[PDB]
DNA sequence: ATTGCATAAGACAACA
DNA sequence: AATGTTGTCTTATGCAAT
DNA sequence: ATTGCATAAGACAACA
DNA sequence: AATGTTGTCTTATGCAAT
């Protein structure tokens, strides 16, 4: 009897196992009347595709500000990541000036090398007429995300993350908890260099340098399992990279990249 | 490669007031830095190498003259405390400092080519020295020099790329772990893992799989 | 050798792995040079003790208020739950006056019952002297959160929410998309009481009301297994209650009712 | 039975301006009193005053009243059939259609003044105490006894008892077989603990060892 | 600038051009607003070869509702004041070569020239063009003229003359009212349904009704 | 038979009139997703002509990509083929008269000489049209075909110049004419082809067409 | 109040209880609350001397003593008193309303206790020589160590009389310079390094430091 | 024998002290935790002396759950009787002179003793006092007892009135050193303060060992 | 054995 | 002073049918 | 088998 | 315009030894 089931949803709208309960009804009638009602199904699917990242080195770097206290009176340092390799790159300024970019990217190609493009943040200098004629007489590519989510750049944020935790533990096992002189400035930035670049992090069995110099890339990738937009997985594609957060895969076919979440991805056989 | 180090303070009028040049060159890469200073200090001797320890890495030993800077206790406090060997020689000497010869001359000659080159004569702009710096620094060491068949990072460095994981061996179905396999992809639970003979890939569980030697 | 990895911890602050890796070093000395560093580990172990309840029907209440925008001009709704069998009790009022706080709770308490104690925030009208003297005249307790986090009274904000969503979908699935008519205001109140009280709420097979009405609470729990603050499990202690949130456990001997989380317990044996 | 019959009818309250027309809704089985009261006797009025009373007490059998203006309405009409229940006319003041309603009229109207010269209240209790008052004298005839019986209207309507043990469940024995007798106390997760109905013992148990009895 | 809107005031006149003889004159239609382009062909000046002039360009570019104009003798003829009755819009004289009638007419003749010039330069031709090249190179100068941008502008010459969502805001809310028009791998584009108007918002922030 | 998009797909034809005489010879080229009815006149069939109105054709309607075409002489001719290769744009030629591609070139053609023949008989120019005002009659027809109306069209060609998926409804079917515009993770976003209405339907309630 | 042993106020007050010895000898402290009455029934030198050094031995040194201009208060005896005891000594009428009344509600409630305890004995104004003293005696336990008023601590416990942890604050930091005193099951008390004083604060919203 | 807990247990006696003359009577009060005393010096024994002492010690202290005194005549009387059971209080009786709960009662009386006869002296009373500096003496030996500690005893009679299991460390050398007492204990680590240092430290709560 | 199902286990969000 | 909660949704799993 | 260990897998946070 | 990330930590698991 799902007459009264559906008088009882629509003057009181009420769960499935209730009214499964109070009118001797079961599974089926039970769903098929409660997602009749268009009220009681209304946020429950949220996408989220989560994907940013290069390839190889020198290919996608990101850059953010930070506004570092014990750095006084010269705060600021700008942070630049190679998202292949995760090596960090950072100077330190006294003004967000377009000049500063200027600088800070001008030595981090110094010491990585040119990379093809730039992600960052639309920040009041980033777009500048200067800084973007300067990065055109260089010839890389700049690309902006969302202007207003700092969470396009997560590379760099975290990056900025950690490395703020670590020049505060270099600090204060220094014996220095309010702030630095400026005569251990450099060397506090030189050490945070050293110890981040040349020595591996976390788990992974690779230094970040030598990830950079000496990076492997597969030529041809394993076959897997796709969680194909349709809803399923599919087979026939292969990953180029799966890293620890995300992936990226390749067709078999059409030798499309793309980023893809881990998630959507599983072995295949 | 990071075995034997030099170093010399050199003048230039024209980055003015911070006219004080440190540099520091490797001997098998001929790699070079350059720091701005204000003015020669025991202290600003410690924030050169520091930075170039970054760039290159930790290297063997150092060999430089006998500056004031360069003599101190500071710095020789620092060098124990990094565990990196000092070596004196003679402000000027020929058997100690060799590539340094080379290297002044170069970045001379790349600092004169690209101050003339963005239009000024005499005084960069406070806000443009480190620019400089940093353009003569990339292309004296990205770019080959004179017959130079490598630029000083592919000597360095060695930047090959591979392509495969490291040889690792893999539970046989008699128990033991055959090397000679390599790893491809550490999905979960699972790594496509080759055979660097049949160059099959096969997915095996993460419990049977222990890298080589 | 550990000499220079103490020397690299205490002038570089590595993580294990790498010092392990980079000195020929190995789990343990890896580890107590590691920990030696006071820097190295500051926050991660942060308490979470989340727990409160009441036990059975008629014994702690929670309150809050509520501005619903459909409901104008008389916005302002009072909300009241019984901990113990989740039923829920509202009423509508213009302003947060302490009269209007008198109004709601004897309505409350002729539906329900009269409980003993009260739990609600340092409202500006809850410890007014008005209400305190009138609470006293009726005689049941009075227990005030910590003043400022609106996240002791969990219960009663999470039936807010209920609440509100249930009078949203009653709102909307009938023609009113901004607010209400003056002549819908009180039947849709009814309406929302009625579904929420004497109606299953997801899975629990027990109604609210007949939760309240005629309750079940054991005399004498079964033995578990549990995680005394003593850093492991103990056993010797049996369990009176056990929500899929949280749990209240019973001593053996000194007959002590805690309430402890969930995790923190195990079935014995 | 329990919640089979309701009753209905109104009552002006002088000692109540402007609000002074007042509802009245009785249970028979249990004699239970709800109230609520409207300014003007509409139709909207008085069907909120019977969602509330089906609020609070739940859903009826039949309700029986007089013939008024808005009783037997169209409104009130499709509305109760719509809920589904039966109305029920008669003379208006017939004892068997109002045949608790004046009992419970008299009552309240007895309990409303001596609330009044309670708290000092002649002639009409202000706008503010009005809702404070109705609910303090709903508590008192509801909760309490007036009768001379050992049972409250609450314990004559929801059968107030304090159980001591869950469902019956009938588990399964590491055999295979499954076996009634027992009913479960606490549903941790993964092992639920059961108790032998005869001799009172328990024991941890998986979840998908036992499956509910009958 | 004026802040009226296209297919408004118009503006006409010829041109003398020994390159396109023997046919060896021209007339383009301008916009006072939009600045966009009309040309004609012909080898001497008649009522009709306005005639030719305005059907072409009425028919690309719409219908114009003023035209103002000079004191052109064929302009006022039997033949195109009957055209102009039966389209419907006024007509207008002055003194030929004020800075109110004759605004951008002359420059547009100017940049037309050039444009011819410089493309029969670039194809190989120098004094002049024979009768075969004219229709594709005026095609080709129209091209460069109309679907490209000139100068600098928010929007090209051209370019002047959806399922409901909900999306958060910085508040927490969830406003309604809106409709992706691009479907990005993790972001979206919005167009507001009352103010429509166009924003870029990542997947994550976004969820439908209904 | 209604296209993907404009400036991506193209086809032509060649028609004679005999009241255009002597430069009978039109040269028709219509847009299939866009529907772009353009022509030029003259006198022969020849790589010259042909080369003419085509690159007349390019920049009154945009760059082509790849334009199918019939068969015959002047197409297949050495002059054109490597105007085809200079320009970019491919050839698909087929039978002189195939009717998967030339029926609607064919209507089009007849459209067009209706037009020409009601606008001329309405100005007074019965049987065959002089040489001042051959270029005003075409342009008079092609104003009556630009943007007033096609014929039957609620969108029309100049105007404009999901696969398919079977969903659910409460009755016990699975009805097709739907196309999912957006995608989602507990729901789809469809739209009808004749309604063109979008809704959002759960994920349960569809599943591919075929 | 800020510190026990701080401010003293000695009174003397009548009770027709223990006549003819029904004069009365006490002390009350401000910031504790702390009673001391010893039975003396005559007020003299020696009396309050008696007194106020018993008002010591059961409480403690003090560091001044509020009464008023009573001749038997400012008298050489109790001056030297004073000052070999090395504490103040300030005169008052008394009756103000923020101190020299505290005494006098002191005095009320310890009454209050004797005429109690005596009829629930069974003396109702006159009592045997052998119970004045236990009368006084037994209201100075039923005053002092159990809790009077809305309290959580008694009396005595109002008189004389952490690791460091790092919290959290509304906005998001974490500061040192705080110490923990009770430790809830889920709640605890922290008290600042410097300000030192004391605040609840959600378990879950503190780590320790270093 | 002194883990039983303050406020718990109290041992009274009578000592004659030969200064209180002509007031020699003197009863006194002990607590075996708290080391507390209280006295009031009175002309007289008797059982309305002996429940005046007790009561006002009561008052001074706290309220004990037993009070221990010497069997006698002296305290076993029907109006100290009706007293207790005016407060409830249960009452046993010993040997009038046994070292069951008197050693310490007798060592506290020689304490006050040598205490009354050292501020005597100071003051500038060798043999007897007036009786109105008696009390002035009370107070300033009792705030010696009480407040300030006696012998090198770091616990002051005040420190255990109204007052962490122990626990060993782990330390780096090898020792699982005692003399540690977690405060506040937490998932991660621990909050332990020394005995005698008495300083709070956080140690991980694998540096941790209870103690017996 | 494969697929499908009925359930259980686990995750997410938002309440001034 | 005095501490998160839980409906809703999603994925995983074992059984039952096939 | 019981304990411990070596490992793997999973969870939290915060960065203008 | 153009999308979270991952080091650090905790819990669980299995094997190897006892
Ligand atoms: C003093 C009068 N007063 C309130 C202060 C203004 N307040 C009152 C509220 O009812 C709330 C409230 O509901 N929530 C929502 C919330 C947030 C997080 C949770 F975990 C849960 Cl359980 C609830 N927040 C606050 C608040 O201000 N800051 C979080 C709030 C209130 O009544
Ligand atoms: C306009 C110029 N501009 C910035 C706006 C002001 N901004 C900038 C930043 O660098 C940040 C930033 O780092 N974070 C921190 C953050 C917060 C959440 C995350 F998920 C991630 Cl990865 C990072 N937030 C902001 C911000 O907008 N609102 C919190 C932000 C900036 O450079
Ligand atoms: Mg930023
Ligand atoms: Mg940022
Ligand atoms: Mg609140
Ligand atoms: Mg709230
Ligand atoms: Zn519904
Ligand atoms: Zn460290």
């Avoid at chain 1, 700008?78 to 030595?107: K, L």
């Avoid at chain 1, 190609?109 to 493009?117: D, E, M, N, Q, T």
């Avoid at chain 2, 990071?2 to 790699?31: G, N």
């Avoid at chain 2, 720091?35 to 520091?50: F, I, L």
Wanted: charge should be positive; hydrophobic fraction near 40%.
């Amino acid at each position: 009897p799902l007459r009264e089931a559906k008088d009882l949803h629509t003057a009181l709208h009420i769960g499935p196992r209730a009214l499964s309960k109070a009118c001797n009804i079961s599974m089926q009638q039970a769903r098929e009347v409660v997602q009749t009602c268009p009220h009681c199904n209304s946020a429950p699917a949220l996408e989220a595709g989560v994907n940013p990242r290069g390839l190889g080195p020198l290919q996608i770097w990101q850059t953010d500000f930070t506004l570092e206290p014990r750095m006084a009176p010269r705060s600021w340092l700008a942070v630049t990541v190679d998202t292949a390799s995760s090596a960090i790159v950072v100077t330190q300024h006294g003004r967000v000036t377009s000049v500063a970019v200027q600088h800070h990217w001008a030595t981090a190609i110094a010491v990585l090398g040119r990379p093809k493009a730039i992600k960052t943040d639309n920040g009041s200098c980033f777009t500048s007429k200067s800084t973007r004629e300067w990065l055109a007489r260089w010839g890389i590519a700049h690309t902006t995300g969302i202007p207003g989510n700092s969470q396009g750049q997560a590379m760099v944020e975290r990056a900025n993350r950690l490395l703020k935790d670590k020049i505060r533990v270099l600090a204060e096992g220094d014996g220095f908890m309010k702030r630095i002189p400026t005569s251990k400035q450099g060397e506090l930035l030189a050490k945070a260099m050293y110890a981040l670049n040349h020595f591996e992090r976390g788990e992974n069995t690779k230094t970040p340098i030598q990830k950079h110099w000496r990076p492997t890339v597969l030529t041809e990738g394993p076959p897997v399992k796709i969680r194909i937009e349709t809803g399923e997985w599919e087979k026939g594609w292969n990953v180029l990279v799966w890293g620890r957060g995300y992936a990226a895969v390749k067709n078999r076919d059409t030798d499309k990249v793309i980023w893809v979440p881990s998630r959507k991805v599983k072995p295949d056989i | 490669p990071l075995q034997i180090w030099q170093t010399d303070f050199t003048l230039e009028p024209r980055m003015a007031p911070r006219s004080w040049l440190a540099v520091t060159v490797d001997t098998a890469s001929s790699a070079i830095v350059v720091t701005q200073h204000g003015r020669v200090t025991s202290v600003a001797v410690q924030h050169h190498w520091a930075t170039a320890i970054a760039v290159l890495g930790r290297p063997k030993a150092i060999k430089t003259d006998n500056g004031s800077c360069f003599t101190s206790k500071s710095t020789r406090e620092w060098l124990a405390r990094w565990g990196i060997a000092h070596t004196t020689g003679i402000p000027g000497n020929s058997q100690g400092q060799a590539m340094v010869e080379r290297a002044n001359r170069l970045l001379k000659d790349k600092i004169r080519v690209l101050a003339e080159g963005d239009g000024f004569m005499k005084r960069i702009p406070t806000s443009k020295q480190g620019e400089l710096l940093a353009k003569a620094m990339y292309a004296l060491n990205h770019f080959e020099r004179g017959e130079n068949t490598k630029t000083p990072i592919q000597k360095h460095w060695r930047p090959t790329v591979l392509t495969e994981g490291p040889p690792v061996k893999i539970r046989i179905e008699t128990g033991e772990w055959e090397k000679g396999w390599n790893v491809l992809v550490w999905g979960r639970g699972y790594a496509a893992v080759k055979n660097r003979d049949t160059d099959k890939v096969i997915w095996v569980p993460s419990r049977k799989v222990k890298p080589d030697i």
